Amino acid sequence: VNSFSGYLKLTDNVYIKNADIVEEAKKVKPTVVVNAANVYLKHGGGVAGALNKATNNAMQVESDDYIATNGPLKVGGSCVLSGHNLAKHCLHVVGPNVNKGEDIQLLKSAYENFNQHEVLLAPLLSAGIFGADPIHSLRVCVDTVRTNVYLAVFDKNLYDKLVSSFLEMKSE
């Protein structure tokens, strides 16, 4: 398990790869895969839709059961559910939806949930549907997370931009 390979090491504990998070999960067999969730665990598009599709909708049914028992998550919060065929566990983390005016500072709270797990395969939280600048999401991750985070960025042009931007900011 946790057989990560081909990552670029950004810091002592943050790694990045140009890869689809679902294909990485199948390759790596991680203990924890992170979902970029919303408070009602309605896994539609982006990472949540991709993860859910790869579980043949089991992650959505499990999430429906969770919500019916526990109610919606809070923004910046998380829950640990099954990783189904992709991982031992899925950590569902809710970044702020910047497009709806939710506090961008809650992206720090969101990434703080990573610190409860020794190693994670994760996406850039809030950087898609939720409208945060991906460069900002990466900076918050690097600054907030102390545990080992392996970031999967599927789009090559974004990957290239993130790496070059990270280098410029790291040295200045």
Ligand SMILES: COP(=O)(O)OP(=O)(O)OC[C@H]1O[C@@H](n2cnc3c(N)ncnc32)[C@H](O)[C@@H]1O
């Ligand atoms: C809930 O709204 P969020 O903004 O928190 O989350 P989301 O829309 O999923 O996007 C979060 C970031 O992961 C990127 N991304 C989308 N699909 C994949 C995938 N299969 N593998 C890897 N990365 C992906 C997306 O392009 C964005 O950079």
